[PDB]
Every structure is written in C-alpha cells, then in structure tokens.
Design a protein around this nucleic acid. Sequence first.
DNA 1: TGAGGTAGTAGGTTGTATAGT
RNA 2: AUACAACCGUUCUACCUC
Length: 679
Amino acid sequence: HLGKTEVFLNRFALRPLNPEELRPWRLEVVLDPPPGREEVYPLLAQVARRAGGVTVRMGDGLASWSPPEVLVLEGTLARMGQTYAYRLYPKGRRPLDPKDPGERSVLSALARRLLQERLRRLEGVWVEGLAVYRREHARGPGWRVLGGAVLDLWVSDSGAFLLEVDPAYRILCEMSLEAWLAQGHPLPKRVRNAYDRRTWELLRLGEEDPKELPLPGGLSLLDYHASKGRLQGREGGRVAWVADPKDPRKPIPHLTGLLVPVLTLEDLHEELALSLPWEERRRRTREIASWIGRRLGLGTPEAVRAQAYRLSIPKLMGRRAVSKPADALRVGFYRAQETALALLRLDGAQGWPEFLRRALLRAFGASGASLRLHTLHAHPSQGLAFREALRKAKEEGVQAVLVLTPPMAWEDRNRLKALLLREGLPSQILNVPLREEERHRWENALLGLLAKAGLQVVALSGAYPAELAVGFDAGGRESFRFGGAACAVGDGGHLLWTLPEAQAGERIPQEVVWDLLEETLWAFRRKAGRLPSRVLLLRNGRVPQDEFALALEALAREGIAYDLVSVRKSGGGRVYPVQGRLADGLYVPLEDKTFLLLTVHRDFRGTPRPLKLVHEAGDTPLEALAHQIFHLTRLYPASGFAFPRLPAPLHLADRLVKEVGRLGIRHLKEVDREKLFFV
DNA sequence: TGAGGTAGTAGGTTGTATAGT
RNA sequence: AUACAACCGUUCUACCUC
Ligand SMILES: [Mg+2]
C-alpha cells in the first residue's frame, strides 16, 4: 500500500572542494594565562572567531581556510571578565577526509564560516548571519521589508559543497524613534537600543530634560550616553521610559534619539502577504541558489532529488467510515456510552439552544447510546454554593459541561476552567453571540465537548505495528528534569494523558520519562487486562536521547517491544515535486534511519513544512513507522474539519502542556485521564 | 473561547560561566 | 542579575481554510 514519485529538496549540490580546502591550515593556540583544561573549548572557538578568518575549532587547536598571514594571529580576549592574551602558530596543513564524519564535521564548520564571511563582503546585500536579503519586497513611511533567504553550507561525504536555501523576509524599521513618533505613528509595543540588541518595553515618554536626570554613578542621562560615544553623529532627542528586559514597574531613563522602534507584523498590518505559493517559493529558491553560486564561485547549483512514496490515506471509522471527525455527528460515534452533559449559561439566558439539543440527540440516536442533558442553575457569583452545584452535577453522573458565554478575558477563562476542574468537570466554551448557520464553530465546540466527556467519536480501523502510541512533550525545556507530559493513543482507539506528578526539581530525567511511560502502560493494562506487544514512542527531539534509556530498558525487562522515533516540527527543509501536484502522505526516506513526512497540505497559500523524523530505536521498517505516524495525524477528534500536522499523541501532549501552563494545576485529582480536558 | 495551516517578531527556556581557590 | 552559547518560538496580527 504505497506509490512512488520523485522530489527536489531545497538543497543544492555545488562545486567540489579544491585541494586547499581539503587541506586546511592547522594552528596551535597559546594563551596567557592558560587555565581552563576543561573550559579550554569555548575559548578555542572564541579565538577562532577573533582571528577574523574562515577558521574553526579542530581538536586542541584550529583549522583554517584563510591563510594564517591574513589572520589576527596575536591579540587579546575578554571572556567572562577575564582577559587573555592569545597567539596562533601555523603548524603546516593537514588533509581532511570527508568520509570521516569528524573531519567532515570540521570541513562543514569551515564551509559555514566560508558562507558567512564571503557574504559579509558582498556589496548591495544585507547579511545577518546565515540570512541574506537582497531585493526590497515592500516599503512605506520609514520602514521597509526586505526579501531574501536563510542559508546553510556544509560538506558532503563525497567532498562537495551543499547549499540549503529557503526564502524569508525581514522587517526593518529603518528610522529613529523620535522621527517615527513624528510621522504621527502610534508608540509601538517594545523599543530597541540603536547601538546594541537589548530591547526595552516602551512605557511612556518623559517630561524632564536629559541633562537633569541623575544616574546611579553621578552622571546625567545625556552625558552618560555622550561619554560612551553614542551621541556622536545623532540627536538624543527627548527622554523615554523603557521597561526592563524581564519585567518590572521600576522604569528606566533613555533617549528617543538612541532608540529605534521594532515593528512586529501587526504594526505593518496597520498601514502583507509574506507567505509564498509553493511554486513561487521553489522558483525564488532556485534563483537565489544560482545567484549565490555565481557570486561566490561555487559553480552552478544541482538541486538534489530524492525518491518519495505517496502513503495510503487511512480509514476513519465513526459508526461507519468518515472523511472527517465532524461527519460523525451525522453518522454516529465509534464507541458511544451512556453520557450525561451539562449546560452552563453566563449570558443570563435559560436553556439549551434548540439546534444544539437536536444535533446532540441526532448524533446519539445514530449511535444508540442514550443521551442525558442537564442544565446548571448556578453561577460563579455565588461563591461556595456554585462549587456545591458543580459537585451535585458530578455525582448525578455529568461528565462535562458546555459553557455558553460572551468572549471571556484570559484570566476569567482560566479561573472558570480551573474552577470546574477542581470538581472534576471538564468544560468546553462556546461564545454566545451564536447563530445556527455558524455550523463549523458550534460543531467543533460539540466535538470538543464530547471528547472531554470521554467519547471516542472516531477511530482508525487499520492494523498497525504498535497498539500503543505515546507521545512525550518536555514543555518549553530541553529535559524532563523540570517536568513534562505524555499523551497516549491506544491501534487507533482509546486516549490517555499523564503528568510528571512527582515534583519539579531534583528529578532524574530518565526516571521522569519512565514514570510517564509506566503510567500510560498501566492505563493500558487497566483498559485491556494485558500489556501491549509493541509501543511507538514519539518525542520532539529537543531533549537528549539518553533520557529514554531507562524507559527502553524497562520496556525490555517487561517483554514489551518498542520503537523510539524523534519528530521535529522545524528543520525538515522544503520539499517540491519534480512534476505534477504535491499531495498529503508524502514519505521521503533520507540518510541513516531518518525521513521526511509531508503529513498535511490543504487550502493554504503558503508552502507546507514537512516533518523530519529519526528512527532512533527499534527494528520496525521505516515505511511502516511512517505509515502509522501519518495515520495518527488523522486521529484528532477536536479539529473536526482539518487534520493536525503532527501525530495525535504529540499534538495532544502539546495542547496538554500548554493547558497546564494556562491553569494551575498540579494535582488534577478528580479528572479522569481518559478525558481530554485540554483540547 | 472553534480549529487547521503559513508568515515574522518578540519572547522564551536551558547550559556554561563571574568568585573562590 | 551580567556575559557568552545553543535551540525552540503558542501568543499576537494577518490571510485564509472547512
Ligand atoms: Mg477546545
């Protein structure tokens, strides 16, 4: 069950490395005072930057593509307050073999630096690292938007340059605060220094004179900024009151002549289309690749191809087959039970709208389960009595409450949610200027409601390598030492979530991961009276792989087969068809155990971002894994009309982590973990 | 709070380090 | 909190989609 086709990656093959590049100059470093021994590594890279060439770190020394005589071989550094004196010593050259991953790594660091350094020298071109911006996409009243691309340059195993390209844009507010003010434009959100990158939350304009404000040092504002050479060639203008990097109420003094506004997208909207149709993006990518090759003498670009296989579209089962979850409202649910729902009105109206009661009764008739609708005659304004009302509805079997309400402020939303959650009542909010013809909104609402209640509504009828697929999210951190969360989808049925639930400090990451996993295991055991034969482990690849060692070990001790797979929402590059149209379910195998996956592609103008996956453990054939993950993409019961770009367990753990973020909510004790309260 | 995506940007986190010796 | 380094980037705004 597949297909076959060919695609271009947004990578390009360029010229072979010439003999000199294959034989970099080697340099021995001498510092004073030496020190470090274990800290003698960031220092090495820093020296490699101070030298001022195409030079990188290589072993205990330096590799360079720049002749040592055009380097700053002797100079000084200031690292964390300490001042070092360095001298570089040319020690001849040493050949590097691309076939050695270490040496090729060095070669690629050199290639990257080559790209950046050579791009800096181009006239009529703006460069901010691995980003180059040529043309001018749009300009108006003091600000312009430049169009270019983000790049990378590394070295193949066959010893040739490889150039990744992807068009981006840049919003430059090429002016000054003072002026910007004049144009009559409104004071922006945050403001930025004109002499560095530190940015302060713009609080208010001042009322006093810069030559008066006494600073902690004896200096005034104006001559403080004058002393450090900043008023040299510019008019300081009026005084401003910026707010600190983090957050505070204690403001700081600044100058509208040393401040530059920073425009977000919305600021431009108050005057866009920075998305590109995939055809246009491919074109511009090619153009910029040939342009770079031309200007840098790297030859004419050969776009790299790759075989791609069109995966089979999954079989979504409600009562019968469905194209999308929303249809199950007409057709019926996969596994319905005796369910009790509750209404909570905050618009001071009475009961269920008729079309909602109808839609629900219909959907449940088509499922033969018997539905029971309650109404909460209670309000949060009551105090404890409200909590009591909630408790009563719970004991009467209510599983979830729909909340008809005008647009709630963030804080009130979270407070209300958390409130119902204390009494074990998941809730779906429906904003109440509500017409019946708004089918999408209230049907999605209804789906969320039912999901929260514990219904299944849809399933994948297929057969898959692992009957348990659990996804791991680590919040916004690079480890589970500070907690994270898991969501489990059982082949394509049953849904569970788990929190770290064991403090957030002196926690061993491996043990956290194993705890999440073990709890999902035990949930599965409770629902099935057995342990699963194989589990699919999905992580977001932002935490070290070592953090799953204990979980894998434990899965083995228990005779449970596994497959560890890493999923990265960003970095997969772009993917274009050679001929024809680009479609869903694209599987694009790549290097050692890694592949691309173009899961989603609907009526959006912009180019799709393929997923990048790495089979890090287990002996399941890649195509099989890609199959299962792609199908897991279609098992999100809350979206109803559109599929998420990520597999259900990861998408779920994302919404979960974000919701715990929004609410409390350490011990969500009364909430059943079969109930997806966070969608 | 209806939800899916591509767009930039702020915005954020985590790691090492400061001095001491 | 300072510096440096690495990575991610929901909110928001917009366009749209069903
Ligand atoms: Mg929801």
